[PDB]
Every structure is written in C-alpha cells, then in structure tokens.
Amino acid sequence: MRNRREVSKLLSERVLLLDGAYGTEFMKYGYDDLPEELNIKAPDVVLKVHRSYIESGSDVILTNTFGATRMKLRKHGLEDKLDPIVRNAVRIARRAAGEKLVFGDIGPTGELPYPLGSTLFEEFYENFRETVEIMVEEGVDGIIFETFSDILELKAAVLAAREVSRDVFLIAHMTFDEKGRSLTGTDPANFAITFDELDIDALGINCSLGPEEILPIFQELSQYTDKFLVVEPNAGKPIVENGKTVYPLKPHDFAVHIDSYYELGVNIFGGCCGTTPEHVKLFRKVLGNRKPLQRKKKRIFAVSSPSKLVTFDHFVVIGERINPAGRKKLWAEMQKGNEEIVIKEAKTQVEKGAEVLDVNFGIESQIDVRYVEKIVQTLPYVSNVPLSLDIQNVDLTERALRAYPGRSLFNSAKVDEEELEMKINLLKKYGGTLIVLLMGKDVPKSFEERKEYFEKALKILERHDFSDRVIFDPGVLPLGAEGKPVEVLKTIEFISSKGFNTTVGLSNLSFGLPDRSYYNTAFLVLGISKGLSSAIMNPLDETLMKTLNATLVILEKKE
C-alpha cells in the first residue's frame, strides 16, 4: 500500500509503536502448533492476536510469517504450503490493520552459511526472494528481517528483497547475545557499518535480551548509522519456573525504558518474545506522540568479516599470499577447485599477523566462477578476517561482492572514468571500499604525475559521492626496472598529509632482485615513516614482520 518514501515521511514525523509477540502468545489461546500453520489451520486465532495489538494502539503489525520461507518450512514438512501460508498471513493482517501499517515479517532459516553449514549465498538469496515476491504481491507496507544471527544470510535476504522491489521499505535486524555478538561473531558497530551502506531503510535489534541489556548494544548501533532505527526487546531474559520458559518483565518495568530508547534516536518501538497486548497498551500511553530525534553518525574507514571489524587507525597488514602468480603448487590446485590449500594459506598468514587477506585467482578465465564464489564466502569464516578482493573481470567482481560476508576492500580501479564508475557502482550496490591505483593508460614515472592522477581520482570520486570509501595505492614498480621508489615515498607522504589511507603492493619493489626481503623491509620502514597505512605484503617473512613490529614500537604506535 505505502512505499518506502511514504513510510520514511511518516517516521520522520513520529515515533511509531510496533506490536508484541505472536509465538509466545498463541499458546495462551490453546494453540501450540507451529505459528505459520495457523494461517491455514486456524486463521481465526491469527486474526485475534493481530486485533489485540491493534486494539492496544500499535501503528504497525507484523505478518505471521516469521518461519515462512521454503528452507525453513521444508523442515516441518510444509514447503509446498508456502504460497497459501504467506498469502493468507498478509490478508489476515491486512484485515486486522485497517489503516495501520502491515510489515511482512521474515526470520532466518536455521541453516548456517557454508562452511559452517552447507548453504551457499545463492540458495539463501533465492529462498528469501520467493517469500518477498508473495508479500509484495499481497500489498505490504514494508519488509522486516527479524532475529538474524548471521550477516551473510541477512545480506542475502536484503539483496533478494531489494531486487524484488526497489520501493518497499526494508528493515534489517540482527539479534545479539549478552556480550553484544551475533551467533557468527558480529558486533553492533560491524552490523551498522556493513549494512548502513546497503539500500535498506532501517536497522534494528530484536529478541535474545530484555530492554535493559539491549540498551548499550542499541546505542553502539545508533552511533554508526543514520538510517531509521527499530528495537523489539524480549520481555526480560527468559527464566524457568515449572519446566517451561517465561519472560518475567511486567508492563511498567518494560515501558520505563522507552524514554532511553527515544534519546538514542529510535524510530519504531515494539516488543518480541514475552511481550503481550497488556505491555503494548502501556507502551502506547507512555510513548505518546513524539517526533524522532536526530543524530547523524560517526565516520570510520573499516572493512569486515562476520567476526572482525578492521579499522584503519593503525598499520594494517594485508597478506599477499593467496595469489597463484609464480606458484606452481598453488596455481595447479586452484584450477582443480582445491579449497583446503587456500584455507591453509589464509590461516597461516593470519596466525603470522595478517589482519586482512588479499585474494587473487590468477588467470581468471581458467578458474571456476563457482570456486571463486565459494572461496569468497568461506575464508572470512575460517580465517576470521576480512578480504581484499583482487579481481579483474568485472562480472566476476560482481559475483564476489554479492556473496562476500561483510564489508570488503576491493582491490583496485585504475584512474579511468569508465572503470572507476563501473566499480564504484558495484560497490554502491553491494557495499565495500575501494583501492584506487594511481595510474591510467600508462604507469606514472614521478611524484607529479602521480599527484595529477590523485587529483583526477578525487574529481571522479567527488562526482559519484565516493570520496570516503577509498584507499590510495601509489603503484610500486620494480626497482630493477627503474621503479624510482623515492617518487612513491613522496606520494605516500603527500596523500597521507591529505587525510587519506594508503597501501602498496610491497613485494613488487624487489621482484627480479636478490635478497628481496631486505629491499621489502627497507621500503616498508621508509613508507610507514611517511604515513603509509597498510601494505599488501608477505606475513610469512619473519625478518619483514619483526622489523615492522620494531618500527611501530619505535614510532609509538604500539609496544
């Protein structure tokens, strides 16, 4: 009925009240069946629960479709009822809602992404796409992905939804434990930074914890996004009384927290498991009519994996090793679709100090795109760290960005209008940061020429509103080919002075020469002294890594 611009307008004018729990309510009516089944078996019960919230003052109610996706329904022998379950649910909610908003509610599948589970990004995507299709056809005022525990699964859900409709208001939620971490390790800042740049309309948190515990987690989230915010705490932490589980937080003790969420910029407030019509009735009285607060957001340059957020506020070691060039064993295995060998190189580099891993597949026309898609999804989970996607083919780049679990660093766009625009557009759609290589047709041979490319890059970047998502690579050329490293050091110092992060493919300096390690170490020390913020380098080089540590200690960047 209403599109995202209209819902956004309404939210900009007033904080809305969502509804309470459905799963924890159906039992009080004598129905302990799977919630989604009632949409067909006892639609009357679903209608009653929705009306109890509308009659309690809710401005928005959720469809009874939390577990209504093929992958989840298949687990209860209901996959073939997906269509009626979802169409009925929406209709029932629409009848109860009248003029109020109805959001299509979609929860996770219960299946972990490969390699923890067996599911690839593409299957999650199709799964969510089908449910969203039905909801959009039936006329929802928005889609909310509730209770997500993994960022890759949630990214597939939001991308599938946006692909079905560019006009539906989309809300993404993750649920966090007491330590402020989702199941696969994502903290609130990581969730915010990763998802703030995707085309969603709002971010939020629901379930797992009560209103008191969610407060600092919601605060962290609010500081890193300017999108609309939603929260639905459980009515206190669940405790056992007589074999069963109960949510003990009463209306008043729950309601008293509304003001504190209002202060942190909340736009929609509701409750999850344990919340009843009685809680909602009180929330309505306490919330009243309020205009949401403003906040903007903290700006940070960071990349992520499900469990790690790497901020560029210290020297970042980017492992160069997953790169087949000049590596017989590795290159052979890549063509054979060998995963564990790349996993071994990933883990070893991280053990040695790499905080991000560059990933390159050599002659891409010789590699299975399915293998790329699998490696990109896998390394962040098993190696734990973010990736620098060193990919040339633009179509292959889109595949890798789509399935990347977090916010990646995309390894380079040269300063060429067409290439940059093409890469900037893929990043805008799938999220991520970009390494911009300071060269074009030819390779610059001086500082002045590199500076010209820098300034041209800034022009093109300012034009596509992308100046805050790049790292500059001056372009290190072989010493044994008149690379003139001195001109690169000048360039690093100049870009650093301008406030931008920098990086270099360090080992290039010494290829062709003997004692590579010493030239590499010497250059890195000099570069770091000029402001170099990262480097694609060999973390397995003990001399290089030890001297790097000594360098950082000496310069007061650590001890």
Ligand X SMILES: CN1c2c(nc(N)[nH]c2=O)NC[C@@H]1CNc1ccc(C(=O)N[C@@H](CCC(=O)O)C(=O)O)cc1
Ligand Y SMILES: N[C@@H](CCS)C(=O)O
Strand, helix or coil at 414? strand
Q: Kindly report whether the peptide bond that precedes residue 115 is cis, defined as omega within 30 degrees of 0.
A: yes
Q: What are phi and psi of 416, to 5 degrees?
A: -135, 120
- Distance between CA atoms of residues 254 and 235, nearest Å: 7
Residue 147 interacts with ligand Y (CB under 6 A): yes or no: yes
Residue (17 or 413) nearer to ligand X, CB: 413
- Shortest distance, position 306 Cβ to ligand Y, whole Å: 20
Q: What are phi and psi of 247, to 5 degrees?
A: -110, 105
Residue (272 or 322) nearer to ligand X, CB: 322
Contact indicator for 260, 213 with CB cutoff of 8 Å = no
Which tokens hold the place of 179? 């330590």
Task: Give which of ligand Y, ligand X, none residue 153 binds (C-beta under 5 to 8 Å, depending on kind).
Answer: none
Residue 62 interacts with ligand Y (CB under 6 A): yes or no: yes
Residue 412 interacts with ligand X (CB under 6 A): yes or no: yes
- Shortest distance, position 503 Cβ to ligand X, whole Å: 6
- Within residues 432-491, the interface with ligand Y by CB under 6 A covers none
226 is in an annotated binding site: no
- Within residues 328-357, the interface with ligand Y by CB under 6 A covers none
Helix or strand (DSSP H, E) at 62:
strand 60-62
Pairing of strands 309-311, 302-304: antiparallel
Q: Which candidate, 265, 287, 273, places its Cα nearest to that of 220? A: 265
The contact pattern for ligand X, residues 422-461, with x = CB under 6 A and - = no contact, is -------------x-x------------------------
Q: Which candidate, 95, 2, 87, 98, places its Cα nearest to that of 36? A: 87
508 is in an annotated binding site: yes
- Distance between CA atoms of residues 35 and 14, nearest Å: 31
22 is in an annotated binding site: yes
Q: Which of 138, 187, 390, 416 binds ligand X (CB under 6 A)?
A: 390
Q: Which candidate, 340, 390, 343, places its Cα nearest to that of 505? A: 390
Task: Tell me which stretch binds ligand X (CB under 6 A): 317-325, 391-399, 440-448, 459-467.
Answer: 317-325
Q: Which of 75, 87, 327, 451 binds ligand X (CB under 6 A)?
A: 327
Task: Give which of ligand Y, ligand X, none residue 489 binds (C-beta under 5 to 8 Å, depending on kind).
Answer: none
Q: Which of 17, 68, 94, 105 binds ligand Y (CB under 6 A)?
A: 105
Residue 411 interacts with ligand X (CB under 6 A): yes or no: yes
Residue (101 or 457) nearer to ligand Y, CB: 101
Task: Tell me which stretch binds ligand X (CB under 6 A): 39-47, 86-94, 179-187, 322-330.
Answer: 322-330
Q: Which candidate, 309, 358, 392, 331, places its Cα nearest to that of 505? A: 358
Residue 64 interacts with ligand X (CB under 6 A): yes or no: no
Q: What is the CA radius of gyration of the chain?
A: 26
Which tokens hold the place of 258? 């509304």
- Distance between CA atoms of residues 449 and 437, nearest Å: 13
Q: What is the DSSP string of 289-347?
A: S-PPPP-------EEE-SS-EEESSSPEEEEEEE--TT-HHHHHHHHTT--HHHHHHHH
Task: Tell me which stretch binds ligand Y (CB under 6 A): 18-26, 160-168, 403-411, 423-431.
Answer: 18-26
- Within residues 482-521, the interface with ligand X by CB under 6 A covers 505, 507-508, 511
Q: Which of 30, 326, 499, 514 binds ligand X (CB under 6 A)?
A: 326
207 is in an annotated binding site: yes
Annotated binding-site residue numbers: 22-23, 147, 207, 234, 272-273, 390, 411, 473, 508, 516
Q: Give me the residues that bind ligand Y (CB under 6 A), please.
A: 21-23, 35, 62, 66, 105, 107, 146-147, 207, 272-273
Q: Give me the residues that bind ligand X (CB under 6 A), please.
A: 320, 323, 325-327, 390, 411-412, 435, 437, 473, 476, 505, 507-508, 511, 536
